[PDB]
Every structure is written in C-alpha cells, then in structure tokens.
Design a protein around this motif. Structure first.
Motif, PDB file in Angstrom:
ATOM      1  N   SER A 181      43.993  42.791  48.431  1.00  0.00           N
ATOM      2  CA  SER A 181      43.221  42.957  47.205  1.00  0.00           C
ATOM      3  C   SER A 181      41.718  42.880  47.425  1.00  0.00           C
ATOM      4  CB  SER A 181      43.641  41.904  46.166  1.00  0.00           C
ATOM      5  OG  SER A 181      45.026  41.980  45.871  1.00  0.00           O
TER       6      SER A 181
ATOM      7  N   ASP B 129      30.860  48.159  47.988  1.00  0.00           N
ATOM      8  CA  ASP B 129      29.511  47.837  48.440  1.00  0.00           C
ATOM      9  C   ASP B 129      29.391  48.245  49.901  1.00  0.00           C
ATOM     10  OD1 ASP B 129      26.938  46.871  48.791  1.00  0.00           O
ATOM     11  OD2 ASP B 129      27.326  44.982  47.745  1.00  0.00           O
TER      12      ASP B 129
ATOM     13  N   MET C  53      27.534  50.578  45.468  1.00  0.00           N
ATOM     14  CA  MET C  53      26.214  50.348  46.041  1.00  0.00           C
ATOM     15  C   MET C  53      26.151  50.899  47.456  1.00  0.00           C
ATOM     16  SD  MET C  53      27.408  47.352  44.348  1.00  0.00           S
ATOM     17  CE  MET C  53      27.025  46.589  42.783  1.00  0.00           C
TER      18      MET C  53
ATOM     19  N   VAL D 195      37.595  48.196  42.261  1.00  0.00           N
ATOM     20  CA  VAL D 195      36.602  47.830  41.254  1.00  0.00           C
ATOM     21  C   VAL D 195      35.186  47.878  41.815  1.00  0.00           C
ATOM     22  CG1 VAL D 195      35.825  45.989  39.712  1.00  0.00           C
ATOM     23  CG2 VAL D 195      38.273  46.446  39.981  1.00  0.00           C
ATOM     24  N   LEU D 196      34.980  47.318  43.007  1.00  0.00           N
ATOM     25  CA  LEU D 196      33.656  47.185  43.599  1.00  0.00           C
ATOM     26  C   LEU D 196      33.666  47.749  45.012  1.00  0.00           C
ATOM     27  CD1 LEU D 196      31.241  44.275  43.068  1.00  0.00           C
ATOM     28  CD2 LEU D 196      31.710  44.885  45.442  1.00  0.00           C
TER      29      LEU D 196
ATOM     30  N   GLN E  71      29.762  38.466  43.994  1.00  0.00           N
ATOM     31  CA  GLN E  71      29.015  38.522  45.241  1.00  0.00           C
ATOM     32  C   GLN E  71      28.052  37.348  45.391  1.00  0.00           C
ATOM     33  OE1 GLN E  71      27.578  42.786  45.162  1.00  0.00           O
ATOM     34  NE2 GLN E  71      28.908  42.914  46.967  1.00  0.00           N
TER      35      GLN E  71
ATOM     36  N   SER F  91      46.033  48.422  47.095  1.00  0.00           N
ATOM     37  CA  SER F  91      45.850  47.287  46.201  1.00  0.00           C
ATOM     38  C   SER F  91      44.413  46.782  46.181  1.00  0.00           C
ATOM     39  CB  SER F  91      46.797  46.153  46.597  1.00  0.00           C
ATOM     40  OG  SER F  91      48.146  46.570  46.480  1.00  0.00           O
TER      41      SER F  91
ATOM     42  N   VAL G  49      24.049  52.183  42.496  1.00  0.00           N
ATOM     43  CA  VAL G  49      22.816  51.894  43.221  1.00  0.00           C
ATOM     44  C   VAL G  49      22.752  52.822  44.424  1.00  0.00           C
ATOM     45  CG1 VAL G  49      21.508  50.222  44.540  1.00  0.00           C
ATOM     46  CG2 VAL G  49      22.683  49.509  42.450  1.00  0.00           C
TER      47      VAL G  49
ATOM     48  N   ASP H 250      33.695  44.926  50.408  1.00  0.00           N
ATOM     49  CA  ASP H 250      32.313  44.537  50.683  1.00  0.00           C
ATOM     50  C   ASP H 250      32.085  44.675  52.183  1.00  0.00           C
ATOM     51  OD1 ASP H 250      30.204  41.909  49.246  1.00  0.00           O
ATOM     52  OD2 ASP H 250      29.714  43.603  50.554  1.00  0.00           O
TER      53      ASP H 250
ATOM     54  N   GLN I  39      42.716  51.444  42.343  1.00  0.00           N
ATOM     55  CA  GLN I  39      42.533  50.120  41.766  1.00  0.00           C
ATOM     56  C   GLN I  39      41.203  49.486  42.151  1.00  0.00           C
ATOM     57  OE1 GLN I  39      46.061  47.393  41.195  1.00  0.00           O
ATOM     58  NE2 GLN I  39      47.012  48.814  42.650  1.00  0.00           N
TER      59      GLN I  39
ATOM     60  N   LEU J 291      38.761  41.086  39.334  1.00  0.00           N
ATOM     61  CA  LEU J 291      37.904  40.800  40.477  1.00  0.00           C
ATOM     62  C   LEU J 291      37.230  39.441  40.343  1.00  0.00           C
ATOM     63  CD1 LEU J 291      36.911  41.623  43.049  1.00  0.00           C
ATOM     64  CD2 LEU J 291      35.213  43.145  42.026  1.00  0.00           C
TER      65      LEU J 291
ATOM     66  N   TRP K 176      39.062  36.052  41.752  1.00  0.00           N
ATOM     67  CA  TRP K 176      39.232  35.776  43.181  1.00  0.00           C
ATOM     68  C   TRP K 176      38.019  34.979  43.661  1.00  0.00           C
ATOM     69  CZ3 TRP K 176      43.567  37.375  46.111  1.00  0.00           C
ATOM     70  CH2 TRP K 176      44.459  38.227  45.450  1.00  0.00           C
TER      71      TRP K 176
ATOM     72  N   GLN L 154      33.789  49.919  38.952  1.00  0.00           N
ATOM     73  CA  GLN L 154      32.682  49.504  38.102  1.00  0.00           C
ATOM     74  C   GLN L 154      31.339  49.515  38.816  1.00  0.00           C
ATOM     75  OE1 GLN L 154      33.268  45.738  36.098  1.00  0.00           O
ATOM     76  NE2 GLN L 154      35.353  46.243  35.436  1.00  0.00           N
ATOM     77  N   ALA L 155      31.329  49.382  40.140  1.00  0.00           N
ATOM     78  CA  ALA L 155      30.087  49.197  40.878  1.00  0.00           C
ATOM     79  C   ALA L 155      30.181  49.879  42.234  1.00  0.00           C
ATOM     80  CB  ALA L 155      29.791  47.706  41.055  1.00  0.00           C
TER      81      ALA L 155
ATOM     82  N   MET M 201      29.939  51.281  35.868  1.00  0.00           N
ATOM     83  CA  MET M 201      28.849  50.575  35.207  1.00  0.00           C
ATOM     84  C   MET M 201      27.585  50.498  36.051  1.00  0.00           C
ATOM     85  SD  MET M 201      30.859  47.387  33.389  1.00  0.00           S
ATOM     86  CE  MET M 201      32.476  47.624  32.655  1.00  0.00           C
ATOM     87  N   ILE M 202      27.716  50.363  37.368  1.00  0.00           N
ATOM     88  CA  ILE M 202      26.591  50.090  38.255  1.00  0.00           C
ATOM     89  C   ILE M 202      26.621  51.111  39.382  1.00  0.00           C
ATOM     90  CG2 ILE M 202      25.467  48.421  39.767  1.00  0.00           C
ATOM     91  CD1 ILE M 202      26.809  46.197  38.125  1.00  0.00           C
TER      92      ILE M 202
ATOM     93  N   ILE N  54      40.849  45.910  45.327  1.00  0.00           N
ATOM     94  CA  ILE N  54      39.930  45.921  44.196  1.00  0.00           C
ATOM     95  C   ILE N  54      38.486  45.671  44.617  1.00  0.00           C
ATOM     96  CG2 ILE N  54      41.749  45.188  42.612  1.00  0.00           C
ATOM     97  CD1 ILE N  54      40.913  42.438  42.760  1.00  0.00           C
ATOM     98  N   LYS N  55      38.249  45.116  45.805  1.00  0.00           N
ATOM     99  CA  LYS N  55      36.901  44.819  46.280  1.00  0.00           C
ATOM    100  C   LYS N  55      36.797  45.160  47.757  1.00  0.00           C
ATOM    101  CE  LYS N  55      33.697  40.911  46.735  1.00  0.00           C
ATOM    102  NZ  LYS N  55      33.639  39.443  46.482  1.00  0.00           N
TER     103      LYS N  55
END
Lengths: 544, 365
Positions: free
Chosen positions: B182, B233, B257, B230-231, A138, B204, B283, B209, B228, A159, A162, B254-255, B280-281, B206-207
């Motif tokens: 992804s 937000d 927020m 990961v993050l 980020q 697919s 918030v 945001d 799949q 991650l 990318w 893992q995160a 792991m995270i 993984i993020k």
C-alpha cells in the motif's frame, strides 16, 4: 536583517496601538528582548515567537519565513486574517506551529509539507477551506494534527491513516464527507481520534477492534449507519462517543467487558432492544448516555453496581417497569434523567441515598404514589422535574428546605392539599410550575419572598382566595400564569411594580374589578382576562 | 491462575537488561505484570506468550521503556520469543556504531511488524531480514544504512507498508512484485536507475514517495495500472520526458509532484492530464518544461494547487483561467509567458500573494 523581518511582522498587524512598543529597530537595540521573541544564547537568532492572546488583528506577514532558525510559532488569539503565508514552509527548523483561534482563510498551504521537523500543527478554529491534503502524510515527525473548527471539505483519504507516530487526530466540526476506513486501525500510535460534527456516511469498520491504542474514540454526530460491530469490545478507549448518528440494532453486550471505559455515549441513534445488564460491571464509567433511542425493557438494577456513575441519561426511550431502588447505591450520582419513558410505580425512597444528586428529571412517565419524605435529604438537588406524571398526595412542606432549588416542575399531576408556605423561601428559585393539579387553598403570599423568581405557573387547579398583593415585590417575574382557578377579588394594583412582567394570564377565575394600569398591557395575550364574570374590561365576555 | 512461559519470560528479562532496563528482571510474571510496551496473549493451554515488544519514547498518554544511551543494545535473546508478532524500537540509541542484527531473521513466521525507526543503525541491511516472511509493516526510517536494498525483500509477499526513508541506500530500486503493498516510501536516499517496471504491477499502492534520489529515465506509461494511487512524489530526481500520452487510469490520484527534475525537458500535451477526477495538487516547478500551458488544466475539477514556476513556458495564459474559481495556489512566475493576464478582479483579490506571475517580461495589464 532579522529585525527587518520582525518589523515587517509587526507592520502586518493592525490593532497595535500600545501593543508592540518594544519592537523598535532603532530605539531598542536588542531584538532578543522584545516582547514575545526568544533567541538561543549562542547565535542570538530567533527560535521561538509567542504573541498569544494579544488581538494584534492584522495578517501573518510572509516575513515570518525570514526567521529561518524558528523552532516554535504561537500566534493564537489575534483576530488574524488572510491566508497562511507560503513562506512558513521555509522555516525548516519549525517544530511547533499554533495558529489556532484566528480568522485565517484559504487552504492548508503546500509548503507545510516542507517542515520535516514539525511535530504540532494546530490550526484549530479558523475559516480554512479546502481538503485535508495527502501532503500531511509527508511530515515524518507529526504527532499532533488539530484542524478542528474549520470548513474543510472532501473525504478523509485513507493515505492519512498510515502513520505510526501520530498521537492526536482532531478533525471535529468540519464538512468532511466519505467514510471511515479499515486502514483506520493503522494509526498504531494514536490515542485521540475525533471526527465529530462532519458529514461522513458509511458504517463503523468491523476491524475497529484492532485500534487498541485509542484512548478517546469520537465519531459522533456524523450520519453513520449500520450496527455497532462486536469488535468494538476490543477497544481500550476511556471515551466511546458514537452519539448523534443513525446506528441501528441492539447494543453489543461485549461493551460490558470494556472496564477501562469512563464515558459511554450511544445516544441520539436508532438503537433497539434492551439495556444489556452486563453494563453493571462497568465499574469505572461516570457518564452513561443512552438517551434518545428506542430501547426497551427496564432500567437494569445492575446499573446500581456502577460505583462511579455520575451522569445517567436514559430519557426519550421506551423503558418500562419501575425505577430500581438499587439506583440508591450510586452515592456519586450527580444527574439523573429518566424523562419521556413508560416507567411505573413510586419514586423509590432509597434514591435519597444519592446525596450528591443534583438534577432529577422523570418528566413524561406514569409514575405513581406520593413524593417520599426522604427527598428532603437531597440537599444538593437543583433541578426537580416531576412533571407530566400520576403523582398524588400533597406537596411536602419539606420540599421547601432544598435551599438550592432553581427549577421546580410538579405540573401535570394529581397533587392535593394547599401549597406549602415554605415554597416561598426558595431563595434561588427561578421557575415554579405547579399547573395542572388539584391544588386547593389560597395562593401563598409568601411567594413574595421568591427574590429571583421569573416564572410562576399555578393554572388549572382549585386555588381560591385572592391574588396575593405581595407578588408586586417580584422584580424578575416576567410570566405570571394563574388561569383556570377559583381566585376571586381584584387584580392587585401592585402588579404594576413587576418591572419585567411581560406575560400575565389570570383568565377563567372569579376575579372582579378593573385591570390596573400595567406598564406592559400591550404585550399580553387577548384572552388574558376572559372568563371572569364580574371583571370589567374592553373585551367580549365582560359585562363592560 | 495463568502464568507466562518461563523461557519467554527469562528472554524478556535479558532483553530488558540489554536495553538498560534491568528492573524488568524483578517482575515475578512479566505477562501478568504487563508493562506498557509488552503485550501477551494466552494459548488454549492457559499459558501466556509474548506477542509485542516496544521501546522508545513514542509517547501517548503513556510512554514505552527508553534505552540507556551508555549500555543498551538489541539482544539476540529476541530469538527465544517464538511468538513475537510486533517489535518496536523508536529513537532507542546505543552507545556507538551498531548494525541491524542479522538474528532478527531467526524469528520468521510470527513477526508481522518490524519498526526500527531513528535508531542510528549503520551498515547494510541484513539479507536475512528476508526470512520475516509474514512481515506486513517494515519501517527503517532515518537510520544510516549502507549499500543496496536487499533482493530478499522479494519474499515479503504480504507486505503492506515499506518505509526505508532517510538513509544512504544505493543501487537501483529492486523490482519486487508485492500485490498487497500500500505505501512505498524510499525518499531521501541515493537510489539510481530507472523506475522499476514491476512497480506498476503493485496495484494496491496508494503512496509512492521516491523524492530526493537519483532515479533516471521516463515515467513509465504503465502507471495507469495504479488505479488506487493517491500520492505520487518523484521530486528531486533525474527524470526525463516525456509525460505518458495518457494518465487516465490514475483516478484516486490527489497529488503529483515532479519538482526539481531539472532536465525533464518536455511539453505538456493537452491530452496528458485529462480525466484526473481527484487531482488536487500538481507541482511541476523547476523541470525545464517547454511549450504552452495546456488549457486542459482549466477543466480539472478538484485542482487546488498548480505549481509551474521556474520553467521555459511561453505564450498566452489560456483565457479559460478567467473561469477558474477554486484554485488556492497558482504559480506561473519565472517563465517567459507573454500575453495579457486573464484573471478576474474576483479571484485576484481572493488569491492575493498565492497567485504568482512575476518575472514574465511578456505579461501585460
């Protein structure tokens, strides 16, 4: 207000005896001229703080988060402890952050992801523990991520890969587990990929040839298995560092087309098959490290076509045949290590054209013949390990005219004649192992001129005469090994002046007399003097 | 003895002249006099074709051609490059307002990477960007883009990475179903409406945001399908409760927020966060979360960072927190917790300032 924060940062250090005497909020009005602080000339607010290499020794105060207009922080080399304070995260303008060479512990803080202007995160060489968090993805402007030298844990989540603007991914020396990914080639702007020294299993991804922006690929010492994918040949790397792993299979011949390569290290794996001769047209590489595998066949003579080769290590393999004379084309060869193989035949005379040759190691082979005379042309030679072979002839007089020799191992051969006296004037010689040969004559007294010598081994020969009494002049000689010869006479009293002589073995000779008072008589082995008939001491096998 | 296709070469000359780099017009063969920023590849007929074209100081060891701020613009002659696979513009600023040119659609099937990062582009995203059917990476980060996200983005069936961060995009997030997608980054815009349901069908991912927008509604209970991811937000939106009753299908997460959704206004059921093996995270600060700290958070194995500051949490701190030795950050400050603090000298002296408990009048010892 800003001097408040700078004073807290000062007060959170420790070893500031005569260090930040500048920093005085009342006896020094301009905080913009204190040591290591820089303001912009309009608002006179702190934008850059560089206290590099001062050993201030404290912690990083949270008050560093109170310099809101900071664009650069450099606190490297200050023995700093504690955790990275969360408040760095409210340095919104921060662009460069270098906390390398300290003792900071804990996790990479979450607030680091709030630094939307950050371009360099350097946390090299600390005691940081925990995972490489996904939050670092980020940071839209991050070009340099150097986390080497810590104790980071977990896997490298794909991650992370990318990212189009990242330049430098340094993760060397942590405890990262898991695998590489194919998404690795999504690092489309990366030039440096270094994950050496972790514990990553898995294989090299077969699509790794898409990673064409890489300049340095380093996954060494990692427990990676599988073979070397063919697509490795599409890389444009100058450094390909795969050593110290568990790679199997042959060396892909396509590696011979990677002409931009400058360092190729495939060593300490479980590779098999021959050295591909196409490696000859790698005319820009200077380091070829293929040692420690199970390679087979010859040293390809095409290795002499590598004009710029300087470091060639092929040791600890299973190579056969002769040393190719074409190796003498390598005018810039600096180090040659062919040890522990099955090579055969003479040391080629043509190898005297490697003028700059500096270390020569052919230990543990089956080479034959005599040392050619043209070895006297190797002026820059420094390390000469011909040990454990089948050489014959006499140790050349000219061998003594290599002024910069500091390690000379001719042991385990079939050398004849007497030791040349010129060996005595190798001024810088530190180690001289001539043991296990058929050397005859006297032990040369000129060995007293070996100013720097620390180890002399001439055991298991046919040396006659007396133990030279000038050996007492040797002020660094700590190991004197003379056993299994035919030296006669008494052990010199002057050997007591060898200020550092810790190990002495003169057993199995024809020495007579008693042993003089040695200042380190107790550090010797028990059998130091056994096998001398007429030698009188307090041990079994002596007449006394 | 190979040479570059002549019209592709003249097009290269004109593209470079338009970007401020008239020097390229002098190279006899741009494909064999290849510069860093241009890439060619030959067909079976020993003819070179231009395949990649990059501009802007992305750097490396080498840098790409930069654009004269007085003269440069994106030339329509790009449409003459029939085989272009990748196009990069990074911080290549023109003189004045410039929109994303619509003619970029006219090089459809070949293009797989379109990166127009931080170029000062204005106005709406052209609809005909949807013609770029085989696009796998689209990056429009930190421009000044008016209006809505085009619905024709539905056509990016093979899209791997979508980055529209840092613009002024409005309207609700259109609901494409992109099966290979992804990363989805739409943070720092002005997007509104609910979380699109079709979002949970891009498996697919993984993020995700979506931070700093105006997205409203609840987190759909169908995020469990993103096995799949990961993050995730979702910070600084207008999301509301409740949590999904179960979040168990989100392994690899893992995160998570949700900071700053100031009207979230729900509780955290004990059952909510069970099963997150890789969390792991977490918030959850400043979201008006109600109730008592679930002790199930104690049993999250990979948890390093737990942020619950700035809510209406009440009651006892679960004594099981005494047995947690892997938390590096834990914030409980600015609630109305009330019991005695149950942390050992063990971890108190390790965590130090990274354990926040202040502004809870109730807390003891």
């Amino acid at each position: 207000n800003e001097g408040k924060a700078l004073m807290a940062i000062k007060g959170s250090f420790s070893n500031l005896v005569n260090m930040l005497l500048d920093w005085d909020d009342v006896h020094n009005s301009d905080l913009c001229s204190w040591r290591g602080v820089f303001c912009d000339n309009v608002s006179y607010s702190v934008v850059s703080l560089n206290l590099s290499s001062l050993n201030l020794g404290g912690e990083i105060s949270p008050a560093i988060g109170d310099l809101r207009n900071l664009q650069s922080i450099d606190l490297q080399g200050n023995k700093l402890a504690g955790q990275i304070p969360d408040e760095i995260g409210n340095c919104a303008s921060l662009v460069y952050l270098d906390l390398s060479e300290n003792l900071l512990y804990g996790d990479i803080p979450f607030s680091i992801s709030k630094l939307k202007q950050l371009e360099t995160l350097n946390l090299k060489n600390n005691q940081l523990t925990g995972p490489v968090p996904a939050t670092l993805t980020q940071i839209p402007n991050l070009k340099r991520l150097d986390l080497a030298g810590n104790h980071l844990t977990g896997e490298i989540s794909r991650l992370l890969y990318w990212n189009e603007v990242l330049q430098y991914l340094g993760l060397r020396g942590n405890m990262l587990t898991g695998t590489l990914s194919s998404d690795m080639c999504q690092l489309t702007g990366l030039w440096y990929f270094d994950v050496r020294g972790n514990n990553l299993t898995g294989t090299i991804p077969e699509s790794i040839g898409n990673c064409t922006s890489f300049q340095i690929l380093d996954i060494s010492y990692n427990q990676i298995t599988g073979e070397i994918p063919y697509n490795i040949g599409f890389l444009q790397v100058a450094t390909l560092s795969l050593q110290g792993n568990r790679l199997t299979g042959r060396i892909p011949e396509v590696i011979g087309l990677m002409q931009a390569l400058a360092v190729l290290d495939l060593s300490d794996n479980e590779l098999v098959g021959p050295i591909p001769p196409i490696l000859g047209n790698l005319s820009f590489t200077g380091k070829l490290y293929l040692h420690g595998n199970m390679l087979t066949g010859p040293i390809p003579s095409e290795l002499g076509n590598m004009s710029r080769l300087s470091y060639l290590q092929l040791n600890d393999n299973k190579l056969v045949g002769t040393i190719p004379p074409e190796l003498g084309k390598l005018e810039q060869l600096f180090e040659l290590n062919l040890a522990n193989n099955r090579l055969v035949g003479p040391i080629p005379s043509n190898i005297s054209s490697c003028a700059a040759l500096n270390q020569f190691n052919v230990h543990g082979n089956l080479l034959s013949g005599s040392i050619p005379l043209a070895f006297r042309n190797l002026g820059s030679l420094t390390y000469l390990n011909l040990s454990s072979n089948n050489f014959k002839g006499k140790i050349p007089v000219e061998l003594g005219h290599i002024i910069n020799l500091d390690k000379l191992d001719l042991s385990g051969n079939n050398f004849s004649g007497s030791i040349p006296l010129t060996l005595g004037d190798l001024e810088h010689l530190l180690i001289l192992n001539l043991s296990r040969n058929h050397l005859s004559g006297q032990l040369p007294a000129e060995f007293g001129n070996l100013r720097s010598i620390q180890m002399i081994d001439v055991s298991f020969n046919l040396l006659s005469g007396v133990i030279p009494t000038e050996l007492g002049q040797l002020q660094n000689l700590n190991s004197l090994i003379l056993n299994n010869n035919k030296l006669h006479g008494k052990i010199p009293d002057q050997l007591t002046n060898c200020f550092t002589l810790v190990n002495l073995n003169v057993s199995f000779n024809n020495l007579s007399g008693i042993v003089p008072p040695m200042k380190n008589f107790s550090r010797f082995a028990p059998a130091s003097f056994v096998g001398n008939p007429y030698l009188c001491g307090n041990w079994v096998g002596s007449i006394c | 003895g190979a040479r570059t296709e002549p019209d592709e070469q003249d097009a290269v000359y004109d593209i470079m002249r338009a970007t401020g780099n008239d020097w390229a017009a002098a190279i006899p063969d741009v494909c064999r006099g290849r510069w860093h920023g241009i890439e060619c590849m030959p067909d079976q007929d020993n003819v070179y074709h231009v395949v990649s074209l990059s501009f802007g100081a992305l750097s490396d060891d080498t840098a790409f051609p930069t654009c004269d701020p007085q003269r440069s613009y994106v030339s329509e002659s790009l449409t003459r490059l029939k085989h272009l696979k990748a196009l990069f513009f990074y911080r290549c600023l023109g003189r004045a307002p410039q929109r994303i040119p619509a003619f970029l659609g006219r090089l459809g099937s070949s293009l797989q990477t379109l990166v127009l990062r931080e170029n000062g582009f204005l106005g709406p995203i052209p609809d005909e960007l949807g013609n770029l059917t085989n696009l796998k990476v689209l990056d429009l980060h930190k421009n000044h883009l008016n209006g809505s996200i085009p619905l024709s983005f539905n056509r990016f069936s093979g899209l791997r990475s979508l980055d529209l961060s840092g613009n002024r995009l409005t309207g609700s997030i259109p609901g494409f179903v992109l099966p290979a997608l992804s990363v989805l980054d739409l943070n720092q815009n002005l997007l509104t409406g609910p979380v699109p349901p079709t979002l949970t069908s891009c498996g697919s991912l993984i993020k995700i945001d979506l931070s700093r927008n105006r997205v409203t509604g609840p987190i759909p209970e169908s995020i469990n399908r993103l096995n799949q991811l990961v993050l995730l937000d979702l910070s600084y939106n207008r999301l509301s409760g409740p949590f999904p009753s179960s979040l168990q299908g989100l392994n690899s997460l893992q995160a998570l927020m949700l900071k700053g959704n100031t009207k979230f206004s729900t509780t955290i059921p004990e059952n909510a966060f069970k099963g997150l093996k890789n969390l792991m995270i977490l918030v959850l600060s400043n979201t008006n979360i109600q109730g008592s700290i679930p002790k199930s958070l104690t049993r999250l194995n990979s948890l390093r960072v737990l942020h619950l500051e700035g809510n209406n949490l009440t009651g006892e701190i679960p004594l099981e927190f005494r047995d947690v030795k892997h938390l590096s950050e834990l914030r409980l400050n600015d609630n109305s917790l009330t019991g005695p603090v149950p942390f050992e000298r063990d971890t108190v002296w390790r965590m130090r300032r990274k354990l926040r408990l202040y502004n809870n009048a109730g807390l003891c010892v």
